[PDB]
Symmetry: C3
Subunit: 331 residues, 3 copies
């Protein structure tokens, strides 16, 4: 089966980086084309009861700040087996359990710069979409309790340049108009800044959907990191969103923040990030969506890693505001 | 909808660069596989009356002088809305209205080395296929008159590395068996040779299809560039083709040429290019063609950019002849 | 037609390079998703008797030791013509007649490290999947005898950086339950290690399918290399496999070896490779197979090339064992 998301975003960015020329280069209008084509199917094997499943999904065809063209396999790509009894098992390239919650609901709308790949902690706070991953998704036990669990090789292990690995787990419990989310990811043998690291991330969160038309989500994220030289790092973060849904319209206010990193008990000042985001969406069709969105990103103004060199963050390119109109179509 | 063009061209090139080894490297037989796979669709949104259109076309799967493999998104790839009243508007990666005229009819067959990317002027005479583009295509007003107009980001801006931008427009008016074409493209903030350029390119041409089997096109192209140091460059070009189509055969002669480049009033000697080209083509099927082609490219023998380093042109690799056969099958 | 091979291999590798960090980096578990998508078709042109055939195949979407994402055209991608009388001709990216036999049957299960790209000989023992190739595949004469023939441009010529080319031919004759195989490849103008090489490579082999469930294959390969500074190099190599097939199961033992390389008449000590492999496979469906596989690779411990630098071989990373299970599903 061939499927696709046609996603296009006309976004103007106004940067305040400290450098005028950097401002000009990074800012401006671009067309963020995140369309992707994918292939998926199921197969009932004669001599095996669990149904075989596989998916190959291509990447963004023409993103902003990037070249044209994407290959098949850049997004969620896997084989696996499923049965109503014990759920779904996927082998390959999937989202970690932690990341799936960080992305949804917490990174919408345009909260990702802060809540998704933002942060200042060393090592690996978590993977996002990872290859070399075994992920078990349980069924909806009693229609309320579900579990995601996964393990996989790290980024350098994926290329034969390392021994990094990671495990993760998330749970969800539905309680009427409420859902309680709890996730964890541990990362190990992460080689960065002349050190080996271990990372532990925990996430708690609630989302609510009321027949009154108001929906909301709130997430708390706690990030710990330990370097082989003895340094310990801590940073926490939050994300919250408020939605009002009337017919063919939806209103959304989002906010997310990274708080000052702490290193060996001392707080590194000016290492926090915050983003405020507003969006109106119009359900133009059962299968598609239009949207306008405006967001303000205020990132940290910089910090050094354990190798006494600047550590990269979603704030190195500097603070920016974004106005965008988008469309999104599913088939 | 899956679609494709299957294009294979077996081409032998004989170079005369002045260097025996370079002649040997660049020349010889190759297979130019410009086959490509596309996806496109329309969708009629319930709550929006203009038809939604989208397309994602892959790149040449295995071209001459290149590696194997093409991602999805490399050729025309866009989303838009179409309504018979006011035409179609596309956002994404399309051809600029200029380039579409310099490509067809004026770069066929094999004229493109001189008339497409050829030429000695600095800055950017025009974009070809460009990402981050809004393009309006008018209807054929009264079945005779059409306008193509577009603005977009530059090559550096698309990467966050510049502030270049451009707009263009082209007009066509069908007068019985003839079509008049005019177009323009301006590029701004182009960073090259250590200067900031503005380009302006002007194109006029004519195209004819008569009932006696004779067909033709001629175009005149005028290219001006202005550098921030006040340097002014000026270069013009022509391209013309004669075709005789009889039954299942089509004979074609093409000629294109760039004339000596003028910088600050002075003609730069020996900066011209010309290509003459013959082609026989067989309509093997309603969906496919076969063709042989021979062409002779005589390029300029070099010039210096505003940085006092040699400026790269389609002639840098050297004069060459080319004998090719190919097949093209649309599905 | 859309088609596909879904292929996933969970592989555990234990290396012994003599550096425990390299052993940790290279070793460990990976998921080797060699899944690919492809498009192929035929078309009877109205004015041409041979059937037009074409195919574009994508690459491994997420292989082990590599990154995610494959483009279209990475695997067999060609146009051509077939007729019952004289066979089929293909232009594009296909397998070399030699390499086809080297891959099947002689590289399975897991013998390719030694027998496919393994070996110590200079130049290019043979191409494998080569672009810029034209390949004739004969009909199966009298349902018994078949010929493959190809010529093609070399890797550097395909980028206009060289003049390497190659030719090859392969014969197959069915004798009762046996298949007899012979094949040859010549490569010319191969620029490596500061020299220009000519490679000649010869191959003979037999395959048997018996009615008691046993089948086997055995192949002998002889590779010769001649450098422009007058060095001559020879190496030979073998590969065999035993199989027993009952109901829905197949057992398989495989062995392959590269023998010591001889250079300028003097054999170079300790340049031989060895692989033993066992495999169990379960025909989990007419469309798919499960398999577990264990194999042991003992590679050469070093040789120098003609540029006084270590010559890369499949042994450079070091000796290693591999335990794996996989699934393969064709649609
Ligand atoms: C049912 C359900 O679950 N959901 C329903 C859903 O269908 C609907 O709502 C939609 O939800 C989906 C998710 O469910 C949303 O999809 C997400 O959308 C966002 C964007 O909209 C995607 O975000 C991208 O994520 C990747 C991370 O992997 C980002 O990658 C980063 O990109 C930046 C680019 O600037 C990189 O920066 C560069 O970095 C290099 C590296 O060092 C540096 O050198 C450079 O300086 C730097 N360059 C520049 C120019 O800055 C950065 O490194 C990189 N980071 C990483 C780790 O790769 C990518 O940029 C993100 N893109 C944007 C834009 O933010 C997200 O991945 C995607 N996920 C999924 C799973 O879909 C969707 O947005 C949402 N739609 C709408 C309209 O709201 C709704 C109904 O529609 O129903 C739900 O129920
Ligand atoms: C050049 C001003 C553009 C505004 C974007 C800046 C966003 C962060 O600034 C926060 C400071 O107040
Ligand atoms: C430093 C060791 C931490 C190990 C964490 C154990 C698993 C925690 O799961 C909690 C789910 O929330
Ligand atoms: C369960 C707590 C959710 C509320 C957190 C809001 C934090 C506000 O921080 C100040 C942000 O700056 C002004 C923008 O206003 C916030 C709008 O976001 C609404 C959050 O739902
Ligand atoms: C219906 C007959 C139309 C013939 C048009 C001929 C015009 C050619 O000259 C164009 C010059 O500008
Ligand atoms: C400096 C040489 C003059 C350039 C010749 C122009 C011929 C183009 O005419 C095409 C008609 O439109
Ligand atoms: C015309 C002097 C020799 C320079 C070689 C350029 C050949 C192309 O020029 C065609 C006419 O202008
Ligand atoms: C070493 C090659 C031997 C080839 C066997 C020839 C058998 C031909 O006749 C078989 C029946 O047809
Ligand atoms: C299976 C056919 C084998 C024929 C050998 C080809 C001869 C090439 O040798 C030329 C070396 O000089
Ligand atoms: C056609 C089957 C040939 C059998 C292959 C065995 C090759 C072993 O030779 C090693 C030479 O040293
Ligand atoms: C129909 C059963 C025939 C089995 C005979 C196999 C003989 C294998 O020897 C091949 C040597 O080359
Ligand atoms: C030093 C050479 C020893 C390896 C020879 C292996 C022979 C295998 O032949 C199997 C039957 O064909
Ligand atoms: C044979 C051939 O086409 N060569 C050129 C190459 O020299 C050039 O660098 C590239 C784009 O700059 O376009 C191509
Ligand atoms: Na990762
Ligand atoms: Na800031
Ligand atoms: Na190529
Ligand atoms: Na461009
Ligand atoms: Na810009
Ligand atoms: Na010349
Ligand atoms: Na090759
Ligand atoms: Na060559
Ligand atoms: Na060894």
């Amino acid at each position: 089966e061939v499927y696709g998301i046609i996603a296009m975003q006309a976004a103007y960015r106004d940067y305040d980086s400290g450098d005028a020329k950097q401002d000009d280069n990074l800012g401006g209008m671009q067309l963020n084309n995140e369309s992707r084509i994918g292939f998926r199917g199921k197969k009932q094997f004669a001599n095996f009861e669990p149904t075989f499943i596989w998916q190959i999904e291509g990447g963004y065809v023409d993103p902003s700040f990037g070249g044209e063209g994407a290959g098949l396999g850049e997004r969620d790509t896997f084989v696996g087996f499923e049965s109503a009894s014990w759920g779904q098992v996927r082998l390959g390239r999937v989202l970690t359990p932690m990341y799936e919650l960080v992305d949804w609901p917490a990174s919408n709308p345009g909260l990702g710069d802060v809540y998704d790949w933002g942060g200042a902690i060393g090592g690996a706070k978590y993977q996002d979409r990872q290859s070399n991953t075994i992920r078990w998704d349980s069924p909806m036990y009693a229609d309320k309790f579900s579990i995601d669990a996964a393990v996989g090789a790290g980024d350098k292990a994926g290329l034969g340049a390392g021994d990094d690995y990671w495990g993760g787990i998330a749970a969800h419990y539905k309680l009427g108009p409420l859902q309680l989310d709890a996730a964890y990811e541990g990362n190990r043998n992460i080689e960065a800044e002349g050190q080996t690291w271990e990372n532990n991330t925990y996430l708690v969160g609630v989302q609510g959907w009321f027949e009154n038309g108001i929906s909301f989500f709130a997430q708390y994220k706690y990030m710990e990191a330990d370097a082989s030289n003895g340094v310990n790092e801590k940073q926490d973060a939050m994300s919250a969103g408020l939605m009002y849904t009337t017919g063919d319209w939806q209103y959304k206010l989002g906010y997310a923040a990274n708080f000052d990193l702490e290193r060996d008990g001392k707080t590194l000042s000016n290492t926090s990030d915050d983003v405020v985001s507003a969006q109106i969406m119009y359900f133009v069709d059962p299968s598609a969506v239009l949207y306008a969105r405006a967001r303000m990103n205020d990132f940290n103004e910089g910090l050094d890693g354990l190798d006494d060199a600047a550590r990269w963050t979603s704030g190195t390119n500097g603070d920016y505001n974004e106005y965008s109109v988008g469309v999104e179509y599913y088939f």
